[PDB]
Amino acid sequence: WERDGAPSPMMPNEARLRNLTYSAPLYVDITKTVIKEGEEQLQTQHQKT
Amino acid sequence: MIYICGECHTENEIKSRDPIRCRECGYRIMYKKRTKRLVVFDAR
Amino acid sequence: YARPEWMIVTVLPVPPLSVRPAVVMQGSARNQDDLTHKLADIVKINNQ
Amino acid sequence: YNGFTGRKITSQIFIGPTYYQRLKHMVDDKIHSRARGPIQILNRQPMEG
Amino acid sequence: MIIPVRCFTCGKIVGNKWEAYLGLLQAEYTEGDALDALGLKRYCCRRMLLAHVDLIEKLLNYAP
Amino acid sequence: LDLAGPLLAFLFRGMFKNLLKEVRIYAQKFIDRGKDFNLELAIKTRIIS
Amino acid sequence: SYTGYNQEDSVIMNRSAVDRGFFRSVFYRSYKEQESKKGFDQEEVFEKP
Amino acid sequence: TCPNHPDAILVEDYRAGDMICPECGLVVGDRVIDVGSEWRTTMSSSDRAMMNAFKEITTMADRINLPRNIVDRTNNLFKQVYEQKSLKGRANDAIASACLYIACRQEGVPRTFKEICAVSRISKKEIGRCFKLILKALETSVDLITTGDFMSRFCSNLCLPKQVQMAATHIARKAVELDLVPGRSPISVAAAAIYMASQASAEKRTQKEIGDIAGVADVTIRQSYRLIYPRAPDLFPTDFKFDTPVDKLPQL
Ligand SMILES: [Zn+2]
Ligand SMILES: [Zn+2]
Ligand SMILES: [Zn+2]
């Protein structure tokens, strides 16, 4: 991620030259369910957290 | 003060104050140009 | 040369500046030695 | 034959191609001298400068 | 990386024989036959071409 | 022989447990306060990275 | 045993061969320096003093 | 301090670390220069509060992949504001979030208040409140944001080609120069400019898509786009290839 925040693929040579870490973003699908003892259940999923 | 872009190899004059970046490429790795001064090598 | 009363620290000596120097780091920001920091704590409590 | 005198060496010398390697250890990387150098301020003892 | 100009042992010119040596090998010459065709009699000079690795060729695969 | 994978898997579970512990702590503060919590804000990305 | 200069695991090298590039090598040393603006008072920059 | 030469500029020597008379040779000071160090060749509440605030700053930064230099700049701002103590009443999280916003502005890569809010539990309203207070306390200022300060992040986040980003930057700057959108927020203009350029290329992004990344309601994008739509041929760069002709751009 550049200073402006623009993502770009990181080549291994650029990581070597610019002293970066060759890392891949990790995302996880998270499903959240909430119960409020009111015989209603709300299930909201946050894809790729 | 010429810097050569590592991606497109564009020579661009860059001031000390302004940010270091390829004018047209946008690349962020810059190489200094070879000195114009003359250095002698003995072929030994 | 030694007395039992002298074992009790009534007056605390202060090491010279040569023993504990003022290191310079990040420019003119004098980095006091660990002894100075303890000495600073000692004097603060002593005055209090 | 002796290079200095050109006379045949009495013994016949085992000579042939052998694969040799130059090792990273150079003498220039190792030679170092000290003569009234930059002592430490706190310890008043020698240190690298 | 590139063929030495001189044989190390004797100083014979070897820098103008790598291209010919490769051409001779492409002509189905054996390595020994090619060296003899190139005038390399002393095994010190034959060593120069028989054991040369031309890394300059792959170094040119990287754009300047 | 513990190669890169199994060695990395050893770290990930410790670091993932901290991540799950951290979201539990973050959520508990908001749930006790009475207000729902934002999942994106609960996750501390620096733990794994 | 030519002149006694190869004794005790020492080697006599041909100076003429060395003159021709025999075991000549390059040594590359890379130096990295970064300018940090941490601290409002101090702001280090690249320029010839 | 050569005894023979009063007021003489002694020359530092790295051989032994001593200062020598510039024109005597006399060594004044045996080895006092300390060559190696010189030439490169139970927590307090204030401290603990700063510790937690610094932890929050780093946590916020990783959410939007900010470089450590901005984090360091934010930490310096927090120390100044925290030590000045004009915002003692305000929550440290709000102060840190406002400091993060200022640090981004001071580095030439502004993030909109919504972008900072999305990474902080503090609402945008409270960040703005602490933002203005911090400027007063520090007696500092931030250069006004422009439309081009967000084109790189927005276009990159929208997976738009470089040419679309270049056209989007040109359209937004020209619209401001022509005063086609007086009083409109730069972010609204940037989103509308991106929409116009995006609609004119193969990679077309809906109004909703640009709003989500830009944080601007599609209604707001619609209003700004309507103002610049009439002058579409003039705003587009001269050397621009139109997948969809300018005359056939969406009208709304
Ligand atoms: Zn370039
Ligand atoms: Zn030869
Ligand atoms: Zn003098």
Length of chain B: 44
Strand partners, B13: B2
- Identify the burial level of H142 via C-beta atoms within 10 angstroms of its C-beta, where 0-12 means exposed, 13-18 middle and 19 or more buried: middle
> What residue type is assigned to position H134 of the chain?
I
- Identify the burial level of G34 via C-beta atoms within 10 angstroms of its C-beta, where 0-12 means exposed, 13-18 middle and 19 or more buried: exposed
Chain E hits for G21, CB-CB cut-off 8 Å, are 4-6, 8
Say whether both H89 and H163 belong to one domain: no
User: Hey, how many other C-beta atoms are within 10 angstroms of the C-beta on A9?
Assistant: 5
Cα dihedral sign, G28-G31-G32-G35:
negative
R_g over Cα of chain C:
15
Cα dihedral sign, B13-B14-B20-B26:
negative
The answer as to whether H14 is a domain residue is no
Q: Name the token pair of H111.
A: 């993030």
Catalytic residue chosen out of the listed positions G2, G3, G7, G9: G9
| A–H interface: beta-carbon pairs under 8 A | 31
Does residue H72 belong to the interface with chain G, where contact is any CB pair within 8 Å? yes
Q: Whose CA is closest to A10, among B19, A20, H162?
A: A20
At residue H12, φ and ψ (nearest 5 deg) are -70, 140
Say whether both H73 and H130 belong to one domain: yes
Q: Contacts by H133-139 with C-beta closer than 8 Å and gap 24+?
A: H133/H86, H133/H87, H133/H90, H133/H98, H134/H77, H134/H81, H134/H87, H134/H95, H134/H98, H134/H99, H134/H102, H135/H102, H136/H86, H137/H80, H137/H81, H137/H84, H137/H86, H137/H87, H138/H77, H138/H80, H138/H81, H138/H84
Put simply, the answer to whether H62 touches F46 (Cβ < 8 Å) is: yes
Neighbours of chain C (3+ CB pairs under 8 A): G
Q: Which domain holds residue B24?
A: 1-44
> What residue type is assigned to position H16 of the chain?
A
Length of chain D: 49
Strand partners, H18: H13
Cα dihedral sign, H86-H88-H94-H97:
positive
Q: Whose CA is closest to H111, among H55, H157, H80?
A: H157
Say whether both H49 and H70 belong to one domain: yes
Chain F hits for A29, CB-CB cut-off 8 Å, are none
Say whether both H177 and H227 belong to one domain: yes
Task: Return the SS3 of H93.
Answer: helix
Say whether both H62 and H118 belong to one domain: yes
**CB–CB of H127/H105 below 8 Å?**
no
Q: Among the residues of chain H, which ranges form H helices? A: 35-38, 45-63, 68-84, 92-106, 113-118, 124-138, 151-157, 162-177, 186-199, 207-214, 218-228, 232-235
Cα dihedral sign, B7-B9-B14-B16:
positive
Count of alpha carbons within 13 angstroms of residue A5, beta-carbon side: 25
Q: Pairing relation of β-strands B30-32 and C22-25?
A: unpaired
Q: What is the rounded CA–CA span in Å between residue F39 and residue F41?
A: 5
Q: How far is CA H195 from CA A42, E8, H145, H210, H228, in A?
A: 35, 69, 20, 7, 11
Q: Name the binding residues of E for Zn(2+).
A: 7, 10, 44-45
Say whether both H65 and H158 belong to one domain: no
Say whether both H119 and H73 belong to one domain: yes
User: Hey, how many other C-beta atoms are within 10 angstroms of the C-beta on E60?
Assistant: 9
Q: Using a CB cutoff of 5 Å, list residues around ligand 3, an ion.
A: H 2, 4-5, 21, 24
Q: Using a CB cutoff of 5 Å, list residues around ligand 1, an ion.
A: B 5, 7-8, 10, 22, 25, 27
Does residue B6 belong to the interface with chain A, where contact is any CB pair within 8 Å? yes
Q: What is the rounded CA–CA span in Å between residue H128 and residue H150?
A: 19
Q: Whose CA is closest to H127, among H92, H155, H162, H154?
A: H92
For residue D9, the 8-state DSSP code is P
Chain B hits for A18, CB-CB cut-off 8 Å, are 28-29
For residue A36, the 8-state DSSP code is -
CATH (domain of H71): 1.10.472.10
Closest chain G residue to the Cα of E15, Cα to Cα: G20
Which of H91, H107, H141 is the C-terminal boundary of a domain?
A: H141
Q: Name the token pair of A48.
A: 């790729």
Q: What is the rounded CA–CA span in Å between residue H30 and residue H38?
A: 16
At residue H244, φ and ψ (nearest 5 deg) are -110, 125
Q: Is H155 left (phi over 0), alpha (psi -120 to 50) or beta?
A: alpha
The answer as to whether H80 is a domain residue is yes
Q: How many angstroms from the chain centroid is the CA of residue E64?
A: 26
- Identify the burial level of H231 via C-beta atoms within 10 angstroms of its C-beta, where 0-12 means exposed, 13-18 middle and 19 or more buried: middle
**CB–CB of C12/C22 below 8 Å?**
no
E46 Cβ contact list (under 8 Å, min separation 6):
E32, E35, E40
**Distinct helix (H) and strand (E) counts, chain F:** 2, 0
Method: cryo-EM
Which of H91, H122, H141 is the C-terminal boundary of a domain?
A: H141
Say whether both H102 and H200 belong to one domain: no
Report the number of distinct structural domains present in chain H: 2
Say whether both H174 and H218 belong to one domain: yes
- Cβ-count burial C2-33 (b if 16+ within 10 Å, e if not): eeeeeeeeeeeeeeeeeebbeeeeeeeeeeeb
Q: What is the rounded CA–CA span in Å between residue H45 and residue H105?
A: 30
Task: Return the SS3 of H247.
Answer: helix
Interhelix angle H218-228/H207-214, rounded to 10 degrees, is: 110
Interhelix angle H92-106/H124-138, rounded to 10 degrees, is: 70
**CB–CB of E18/E50 below 8 Å?**
no
Ligand number nearest to the C-alpha of B25: 1
> What residue type is assigned to position C13 of the chain?
P
Q: Which domain holds residue H99?
A: 44-141
Put simply, the answer to whether D20 touches G23 (Cβ < 8 Å) is: yes
Report the number of distinct structural domains present in chain B: 1
The answer as to whether H234 is a domain residue is yes
How far is F40 from chain A, CA to nearest CA, in Å?
7
Which of H96, H125, H141 is the C-terminal boundary of a domain?
A: H141
Does residue C47 belong to the interface with chain G, where contact is any CB pair within 8 Å? no
The answer as to whether H227 is a domain residue is yes
Put simply, the answer to whether H72 touches G38 (Cβ < 8 Å) is: yes
Q: What is the rounded CA–CA span in Å between residue D28 and residue E54?
A: 30
**CB–CB of B21/B5 below 8 Å?**
no
- Centre of ligand 1 to C-alpha B17, Å, is 19
Length of chain F: 49
The answer as to whether H5 is a domain residue is no
Q: Tokens 């020579």: give the residue.
A: B11
Put simply, the answer to whether G40 touches H76 (Cβ < 8 Å) is: yes
The answer as to whether H198 is a domain residue is yes
> What residue type is assigned to position A12 of the chain?
P
Say whether both H89 and H120 belong to one domain: yes
Q: Nearest by CB to F49, from H62, H120, H121: name it.
A: H62
Q: What is the rounded CA–CA span in Å between residue H56 and residue F41?
A: 11
* Chain A interface residues (partner F, CB cutoff 8 A): 23, 26, 30, 32, 34, 46, 49
> What residue type is assigned to position G30 of the chain?
S
Chain E hits for G14, CB-CB cut-off 8 Å, are 8-9
Length of chain H: 252
G19 included as an active-site residue: no
Q: Name the token pair of F7.
A: 């060695």
